[PDB]
Amino acid sequence: DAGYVSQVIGPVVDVRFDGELPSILSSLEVEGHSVRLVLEVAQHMGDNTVRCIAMDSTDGLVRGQKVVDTGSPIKVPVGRGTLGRIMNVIGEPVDEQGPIDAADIWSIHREAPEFTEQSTEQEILVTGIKVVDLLAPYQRGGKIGLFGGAGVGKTVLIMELINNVAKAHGGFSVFAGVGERTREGNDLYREMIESGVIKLGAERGNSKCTLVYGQMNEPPGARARVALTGLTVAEYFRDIEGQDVLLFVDNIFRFTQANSEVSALLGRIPSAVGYQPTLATDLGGLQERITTTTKGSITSVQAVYVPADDLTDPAPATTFAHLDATTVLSRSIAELGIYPAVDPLDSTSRMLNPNVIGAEHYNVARGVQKVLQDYKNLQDIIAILGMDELSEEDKLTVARARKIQRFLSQPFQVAEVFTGTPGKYVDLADTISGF
Amino acid sequence: ILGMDELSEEDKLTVARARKIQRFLSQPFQVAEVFTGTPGKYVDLADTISGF
Amino acid sequence: ADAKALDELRKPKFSSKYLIQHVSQKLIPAVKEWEKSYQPPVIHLGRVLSVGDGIARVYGLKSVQAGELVCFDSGVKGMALNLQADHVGVVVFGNDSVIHQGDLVYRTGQIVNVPIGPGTLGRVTDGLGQPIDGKGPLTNVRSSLVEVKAPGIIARQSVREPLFTGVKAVDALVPIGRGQRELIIGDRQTGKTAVAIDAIIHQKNCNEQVPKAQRVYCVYVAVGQKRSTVAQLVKLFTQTGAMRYTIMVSATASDAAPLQFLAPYSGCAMAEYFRDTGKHGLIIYDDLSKQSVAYRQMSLLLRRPPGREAFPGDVFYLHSRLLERAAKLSKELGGGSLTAFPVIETQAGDVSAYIATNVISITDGQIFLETELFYKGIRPALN
Amino acid sequence: KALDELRKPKFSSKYLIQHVSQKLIPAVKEWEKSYQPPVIHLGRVLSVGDGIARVYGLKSVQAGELVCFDSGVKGMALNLQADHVGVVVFGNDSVIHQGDLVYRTGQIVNVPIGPGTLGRVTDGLGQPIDGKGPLTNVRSSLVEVKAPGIIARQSVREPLFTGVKAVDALVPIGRGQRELIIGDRQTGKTAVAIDAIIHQKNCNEQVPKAQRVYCVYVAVGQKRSTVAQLVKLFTQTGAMRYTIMVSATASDAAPLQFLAPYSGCAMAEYFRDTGKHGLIIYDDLSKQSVAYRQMSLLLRRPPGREAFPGDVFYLHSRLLERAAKLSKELGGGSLTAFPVIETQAGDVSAYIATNVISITDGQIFLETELFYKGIRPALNVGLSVSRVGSAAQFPGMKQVAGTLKLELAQYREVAAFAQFGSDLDAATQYVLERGARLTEMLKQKQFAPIPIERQTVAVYAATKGFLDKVRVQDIVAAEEAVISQVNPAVFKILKANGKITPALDAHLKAELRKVKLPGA
Amino acid sequence: LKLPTAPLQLSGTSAQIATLLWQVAAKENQLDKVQDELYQFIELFKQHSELRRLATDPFVPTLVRTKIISSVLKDSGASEITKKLFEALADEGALSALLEVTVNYEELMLAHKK
Amino acid sequence: SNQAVKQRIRAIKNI
Ligand SMILES: Nc1ncnc2c1ncn2[C@@H]1O[C@H](COP(=O)(O)OP(=O)(O)OP(=O)(O)O)[C@@H](O)[C@H]1O
Ligand SMILES: Nc1ncnc2c1ncn2[C@@H]1O[C@H](COP(=O)(O)OP(=O)(O)OP(=O)(O)O)[C@@H](O)[C@H]1O
Ligand SMILES: Nc1ncnc2c1ncn2[C@@H]1O[C@H](COP(=O)(O)OP(=O)(O)O)[C@@H](O)[C@H]1O
Ligand SMILES: [Mg+2]
Ligand SMILES: [Mg+2]
Ligand SMILES: [Mg+2]
């Protein structure tokens, strides 16, 4: 009934099943291991042998170690009983508050809903950030991307998003920390303890967010599926209990990176710049489950790492197509000290049509984009002359765009711990009139 | 692109001094005199420290 | 071990028989005692040798044609791409998580078919012709191949008739003929989909003003997009009323990569019904540069030898045999036409890239959409 | 023909002859008298070469288990294939023959940790190479431990002082974070790391025993002469009594340069796990990645970008995430990591450089075009960030440091116009001169780290405009004259009081008036 | 140990078994006994189809492929070499390597027979 | 590095 380990190459284990092989994406428990080792079946090799990826470190696996089949994929606890907990990739508690209560134990792998259960309701989400509320307005129910390199302000932007919309929201929310630092995962956990979003002890049921953590130390089998774990925890709230959820994914780049780290050991010959051949298909199979259906809604905020500020790299370039609103951050505006470092001539939305926000918001946003593009087209002259030969025609455009550049910046409440300035919440009519 | 007629006095001083110390790093070698003609120069450490 | 010493073993050279006549009367009960740990050996059927990442290797299937729909016993379709001496490398139209080592594969006798005709007009099918819009099966329609040959030199005539995009910059500066391949190339978020939508909406607005044979029937092939984006597109093409004339073949990002590969061929095979029968067609392959990545995925998992940017050698052949189907037929062939608008996304304006070089070599002219003019107020950003 | 199905032998293995030899050889009637070599805890070498041994047998070996060859040289069972085991070799492979016996040890790779490693210079496996005897007061811990999770950590509040002015003011470092030192060759990376270790020796005598930071220097891939210069320097300064020196050098085998930072991190985790604080410096983490690339390419693992394997992100991430500030229920200890990365002509778009930039918290990005402009330590201020911010900056240094950042930010955006000396503005020339004095302020000699109180006094000297009369060519002497001509009674109370108190800002407003300056 | 030297050297991985089969038969002086049994096996694969299914069909389990050959060769007066040869090939599925492990045995046999 | 040259080309091209 069991199979046995035949081959261990890093995070990729080949398990040889004497008859009745497990299905692909099925989960397998290694009996005899010290820690709970879980392998997910990646492919069938053809000689009564599946090739798996491991959800923990394989240091200590013996060939011939028995492996039991679970007959299903990785099943995680979902429901109200996870609200206010920290979950593993395989649904184990890592918050040391005891076991997790269970409405059900849902498997982490599904299909995107169908084409028929799509809700075509483009409706705005007000954030409290002037450049977000102005030039790239967010959708309630649609996927949001925070593109940037390392150190430009993605996690601080997603923290201001968390305390701006997930603080005051009707339904629950899920923070899926996919392959990020353990330090900032702890800082977010403690900040959500201290502001009451996660309550400990017997007030646990009134908490309104579930943490799922798959951080950088964990081997890429775990980092590749902790996003699907967090998405399953959100999908229980969207489908069964029928409500509006938010799915804050921190660095969805690490999901594709985690697939790329194991893909060469899966027998796949390498694609372009360092990634797997099935990059776009894995990214689409994850991303297409995050939709507002006829049942509920999942308003996802996806941080995306952009390697060395190169948006032409395919792992940030493919995930521009699965989004409704992109908030591209830049090192160049961060060199000016302006925060949030959102590029106003690269951040788009489908909510920037005049049929969804009105002509006053669309025309103010397009006027801001026009004066900023005029300024970027005059910087090549004013870096060699210095604003003396434009003769008060295109000089006022520079002295209005240089004011709009400063006024797009905004102090964040989550950045008061860094810099001694209080945080702001700018209402939508207020920033529209001010711009 | 703009030539030396664009720099300030403090910059067109260091252009001249740096072009001078570029040439002063050159030295005729004793083993290169077979194809250059100029005899070789052993330059002492005190000589080059004082000269620069 | 060599060959000359190995064919001489077919002639029997034993000349002693104290093993043959002992085990020949022992073999058949010894093989009958494990008769239930067997699978019956397949010749014309196929048993899945090994499956993984959307690729099944299939032992057997002795008489499959190359490019033929095979059908796994779990109901999942397949396509025998490369036939090898020991196995068949089939690509799986759908999730390979239902396929196991040992499942039976049955060939269907058919190279890949999509339903073409008047009954597919106004529907939203996926990349195989199966409708996803949820309004019943395809009636008033017939099967046809996705891989028909392009019409030759002598079957075409000169592109003398204009196809009005309804866009001022495209109609004045870079005008389109009624059988022309015109690439819409640009960055992301520069309005390529918008130019294609404007073409389709204007074709609808002019179908109510032309006498039934100057009518243009559109096809929007959405390869690798979101499902919600395609739902917005169906919402807009129904609120304009364009869906009396447009077909949508949509293989989205969650569909398996052979479906995203085969969706431009399915859309063009449905659009060639109007070209073959005297009407006029219009097709927009939206993100042909995602069909390219799906084809690269299937070719790298089938261990085809990669070229530059890991695309296989036949990636120019891939887009060229699709785009040369957009013709203007001669009057002996009905005089119909089909004009294509492939959409290629560049990255930071890098038009020197490999797939962009391919489709620029194939098509009859670009519509560049620069991201600098798109924020300089100029929308459409026609460079 | 019915014989053509068996024409080409379909071979499912490469070492088939070593299995048919296991059954044909005991078929000799002479040779059943226990005449069979065993395979459970022993293994024959199949093929040696380039520091890899393919070993037949070892049916009970674990992945990553330390095995031993009968020649004496150890190894690590890394690939566990269906028939053989790929054993990387912890020494020279020249002493390992085809057919030698490999003994498994039952152990994953171990290092001696404890207080007995302080003062000693070890290699990448813990053997001391200094020649003062073996390691005595140590116990053997694992080298590949799991990094501590979300509950095991806490926030980084307390600061770690480097003694370098451009990184205690602009890029401040807290006990528990990981700060990358990235630059080109010969720019200041080993110099900044050495100044950090020497300043930890300077701070360890003025604090109680719960605040002492015991450094660990990991030198991967350098010469032994460089390590001898550094051990001579850490003995001359006196910092050896707090420092462990782990040196897998360039002649050492590629698995030793691979496993040296895990060795040094496991040695530093002893001080982290016992409530004390550590400072691990993985010098040239890029050379660890090069050694791992060699070790994986010779194991026939498929290469990727720059021929690096897939798991080279995991290689550095599972090492750097072991630098944590532990919670109060685990002793509250910390570990600060300083990975050093060498880039090629300032290219941070390289593979390993992007990996360890995305892994770590900050980066101290040093440039060779500012190194030769006299600005040494060559910190590119515009790109050097620290993502703990001012949470673990010294208050008092924090009170001038944000303005220091702001004024250098203004000086950087007023630059690339200073070729127009005729352009007399007086609205830009003040900040163009003030930024020059601030740039001249953050210059520092190497091997002499200044304490934090003298640093914040000397930045309070320049952010207020007390040095505005002084010419830009002698502020490096003006700062020494300011530090040596103010009272030695203020630094004692700014070290204790922890911020510029209002009973100190008006005292030392006026104490910086009775100092005389080299500038007129 | 001490195995007698082959009269000629040959190639790899199929002529290595035939060099091993000769070296283990010359220690027992059954050289024409096990050469004749290999010739019987080549005709045996032409006689049956259910025995050439144990060399080519990739879906037979390793337990089935090793229990048929054991139960077929538990008797019949076959040598202890050749019974340990066919069990050692059927474990690895190298029964299709018989057709050229017998060929390199003849060229080894026509060398000390000169 | 390869992005420096293509941007520097546009810099010199507008100069
Ligand atoms: N001519 C136009 N006038 C005003 N707005 C436009 C115009 N064209 C496009 N837009 C706006 O720009 C946004 C992007 O347009 P579109 O979706 O056509 O680009 P795209 O090339 O499909 O980008 P991607 O391929 O990344 O989705 C849309 O939200 C649309 O509202
Ligand atoms: N702040 C400084 N002041 C004066 N000299 C310095 C300073 N920093 C570095 N140097 C000198 O510059 C040289 C730089 O060597 P460094 O220690 O930077 O090597 P590295 O860049 O860390 O690595 P590598 O040895 O590969 O170059 C050394 O000779 C050092 O003495
Ligand atoms: N609103 C803000 N105010 C001040 N600093 C900010 C702000 N947003 C980002 N930053 C700075 O940007 C840096 C990167 O922050 P973070 O988002 O954690 O990194 P990443 O963008 O790589 O995830 C931090 O050091 C922080 O100081
Ligand atoms: Mg982050
Ligand atoms: Mg598009
Ligand atoms: Mg150095």
From TrEMBL, chain A:
Keywords: ATP synthesis, ATP-binding, CF(1), Hydrogen ion transport, Hydrolase, Ion transport, Membrane, Metal-binding, Nucleotide-binding, Translocase, Transport. GO terms for cellular component: mitochondrial inner membrane; proton-transporting ATP synthase complex. It catalyses: ATP + H2O + 4 H(+)(in) = ADP + phosphate + 5 H(+)(out). This is ATP synthase subunit beta. The keyword Phosphoprotein does not apply. Its EC number is 7.1.2.2. ATP 3 binds at R350, N353. The gene is atp2. The chain holds residues 36 to 470 of 574 of the full protein. One of its GO terms (biological process) is proton motive force-driven mitochondrial ATP synthesis. F-type ATPases have 2 components, CF(1) - the catalytic core - and CF(0) - the membrane proton channel. CF(1) and CF(0) have multiple subunits. It comes from Polytomella sp. Pringsheim 198.80. Belongs to the ATPase alpha/beta chains family. ADP binds at G151, V152, G153, K154, T155, V156, R181, Y339, F418. Residues 140-334 form the AAA+ ATPase domain. ATP 1 binds at S349, R350, N353. Mg(2+) 2 binds at T155, E184. Produces ATP from ADP in the presence of a proton gradient across the membrane. It is an enzyme of class 7 (translocase). ATP 2 binds at R350. It is found in: Mitochondrion inner membrane.
From TrEMBL, chain C:
It comes from the Eukaryota. Residues 45-109 form the ATPase F1/V1/A1 complex alpha/beta subunit N-terminal domain. Keywords: ATP synthesis, ATP-binding, CF(1), Hydrogen ion transport, Hydrolase, Ion transport, Membrane, Metal-binding, Mitochondrion, Mitochondrion inner membrane, Nucleotide-binding, Transport. It is found in: Mitochondrion inner membrane. ATP binds at Q189, T190, G191, K192, T193, A194, R379. Coiled coil: none annotated. One of its GO terms (cellular component) is proton-transporting ATP synthase complex. One of its GO terms (molecular function) is ATP binding. Residues 166-383 form the ATPase F1/V1/A1 complex alpha/beta subunit nucleotide-binding domain. Mg(2+) 1 binds at T193. Mg(2+) 3 binds at T193, D286, D287. Mg(2+) 2 binds at T193, D286. The keyword Ion transport applies. Belongs to the ATPase alpha/beta chains family. Mitochondrial membrane ATP synthase (F(1)F(0) ATP synthase or Complex V) produces ATP from ADP in the presence of a proton gradient across the membrane which is generated by electron transport complexes of the respiratory chain. F-type ATPases consist of two structural domains, F(1) - containing the extramembraneous catalytic core, and F(0) - containing the membrane proton channel, linked together by a central stalk and a peripheral stalk. During catalysis, ATP synthesis in the catalytic domain of F(1) is coupled via a rotary mechanism of the central stalk subunits to proton translocation. This is ATP synthase subunit alpha. It comes from Polytomella sp. Pringsheim 198.80. The gene is atp1. The chain holds residues 40 to 422 of 562 of the full protein.
Automatic annotation (TrEMBL), chain E:
Signal peptide: none annotated. Transmembrane segments: none annotated. It is found in: Membrane. It comes from the Eukaryota. Belongs to the ATPase delta chain family. This is Mitochondrial ATP synthase subunit OSCP. It comes from Polytomella sp. Pringsheim 198.80.
TrEMBL record, chain F:
Belongs to the ATPase gamma chain family. The lineage of its organism: Eukaryota, Viridiplantae, Chlorophyta, core chlorophytes, Chlorophyceae. This is F-ATPase gamma subunit. The chain holds residues 39 to 53 of 317 of the full protein. It is found in: Mitochondrion inner membrane. It comes from the Eukaryota.
